[PDB]
């Protein structure tokens, strides 16, 4: 119904450090004929579920160094790929990707798999979407690991959540230009620029899902939804603030990638004040936007903060 295409499996033959088996769902309510891929690691009967949400322009491959740390602690780890990315199917029209299209996929997934005692792990788009989830069914969420991300509220309510869009020029302006303009977008080159510590092999794992441009409509729309927030996004993100501030009673762990020009200190300090009981953030000095590429340390530390409370 939604015209989509699927990445050929051979594209993922030679992945580096990604020995996780695939799981797929193609029966989601509202998502007819669309197949979603997701990792399901560690003990499936575990009490604790770590739900790892990726952002722009990556996939579950992003959490590859984190997954094993969480699985080794005795937690089941779920890492889905959004429609348009990684091993999931990719709608071909940019108009098909909306804030609600991606948000409703997540609620559907959560319900379909019946996840409970969830430790939400977010970053970038994983957080813009992810942070609006608990208020829809609060009994399923218990903890939060927040890396560089915020809420897509209107500019008046939270100016810090809108300011990074225009300044600095080598920040979100540069990122968006790099993503929406090339007619021949090479994700491996983009990734090596924005995550300078990646090896050649790691960089190509991020280009793997996209043989050509026809596969990159969701990649292209994400940055535009940051710049042009529709009303449902604004209303839902505005309503999530109240939830974080007054309603949330779980545990939180925050890590900030200090070299991030998009969502660094001036976006995440303000986020820290809105999350009831959020503690002092772990500042990672050598980390950029993709904190996850210094993921083992964050996972290790997060588990240690959480255990010092059980």
Q: Return the residues of window 217-276 that contact Cl ion according to CB under 5 A.
A: 222-223, 226
Q: Is 175 marked within a binding site? A: yes
Peptide bond into 168 cis (omega under 30): yes
Beta bridge partners of 283: 256
Give the 3-state secondary structure of residue 62.
helix
Least Å distance, CB 58 to Cl ion, is: 11
Least Å distance, CB 56 to Cl ion, is: 4
**Residues identified as active-site:** 124, 260, 289
Single out the segment in contact with Cl ion by CB under 5 A; choices: 52-60, 66-74, 142-150, 230-238: 52-60
218 or 223: whose CB is closer to Cl ion? 223
Single out the segment in contact with Cl ion by CB under 5 A; choices: 6-14, 55-63, 247-255, 256-264: 55-63
Q: Is 244 marked within a binding site? A: no
Least Å distance, CB 128 to Cl ion, is: 9
Single out the segment in contact with Cl ion by CB under 5 A; choices: 43-51, 54-62, 252-260, 270-278: 54-62
Q: Please, are residues 172 and 165 in contact by the beta-carbon 8 Å criterion?
A: yes
The number of residues that bind Cl ion (CB under 5 A) is: 4
Alpha carbon 11 to chain centroid, angstroms: 22
Least Å distance, CB 222 to Cl ion, is: 4
190 or 248: whose CB is closer to Cl ion? 190
The pair of structure tokens assigned to 79 is: 């890492």
222 or 253: whose CB is closer to Cl ion? 222
215 or 243: whose CB is closer to Cl ion? 215
Give the 3-state secondary structure of residue 235.
helix
Please report, in angstroms and rounded to a whole number, the separation of the first and last CA atoms in the chain: 47
DSSP 142: E
Least Å distance, CB 48 to Cl ion, is: 30
The residues, ordered by sequence, that sit 6+ positions from 43 with a Cβ below 8 Å of its Cβ are 71, 74, 75, 76
Strand spans (E) along 92-192: 118-122, 141-147
Of these, 20, 36, 42, 56, which contacts Cl ion (CB under 5 A)? 56
Phi, psi of 35 (to 5 degrees): -100, 125
194 or 244: whose CB is closer to Cl ion? 194
The residues, ordered by sequence, that sit 6+ positions from 282 with a Cβ below 8 Å of its Cβ are 253, 254, 255, 256, 298, 301
The residues, ordered by sequence, that sit 6+ positions from 221 with a Cβ below 8 Å of its Cβ are 84, 94, 97
Position 94 contacts Cl ion (CB under 5 A): no
Phi, psi of 146 (to 5 degrees): -110, 120
Binding residues for chloride: 125, 175
Which positions touch Cl ion (CB under 5 A)? Answer: 56, 222-223, 226
């Amino acid at each position: 119904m939604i015209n989509a295409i699927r990445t050929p499996d051979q594209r993922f033959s030679n992945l580096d450090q990604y020995p996780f088996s695939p799981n797929y769902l193609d029966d989601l309510p509202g998502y007819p004929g669309l197949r979603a891929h997701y990792l399901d690691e560690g003990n499936s009967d575990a009490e604790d579920v770590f739900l790892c949400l990726h952002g722009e322009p990556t996939w579950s491959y992003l959490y590859r160094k984190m997954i094993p740390v969480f699985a080794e602690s005795g937690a089941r780890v779920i890492a889905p790929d959004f429609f348009g990315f990684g091993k999931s199917d990719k709608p071909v029209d940019e108009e098909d990707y909306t804030f609600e299209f991606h948000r409703n996929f997540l609620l559907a997934l959560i319900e379909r798999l019946d996840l409970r005692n969830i430790t939400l792990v977010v970053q970038d788009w994983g957080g813009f979407l992810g942070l609006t989830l608990p208020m829809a069914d609060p009994s399923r969420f218990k903890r939060l690991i927040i890396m560089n991300a915020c809420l897509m509220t209107d500019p008046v309510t939270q100016p810090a959540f809108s300011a990074f869009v225009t300044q600095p020029a080598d920040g979100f302006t540069a990122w968006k230009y790099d993503l929406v303009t090339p007619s021949d977008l090479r994700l491996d080159q983009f990734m090596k620029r924005w995550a300078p510590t990646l090896t050649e092999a790691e960089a190509s794992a991020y280009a793997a899902p996209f043989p050509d441009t026809s596969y990159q409509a969701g990649v292209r729309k994400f940055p535009k939804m940051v710049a042009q927030r529709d009303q449902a996004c604004i209303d839902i993100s505005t309503e999530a603030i109240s939830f974080w501030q007054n309603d949330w009673n779980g545990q939180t762990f925050m890590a900030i990638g200090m070299k991030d020009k998009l969502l660094g200190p001036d976006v995440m300090y303000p986020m820290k004040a809105l999350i009831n009981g959020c503690p002092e953030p772990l500042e990672i000095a050598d980390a950029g936007h993709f904190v996850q590429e210094f993921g083992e340390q964050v996972a290790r530390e997060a588990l240690k903060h959480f255990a010092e409370t059980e």
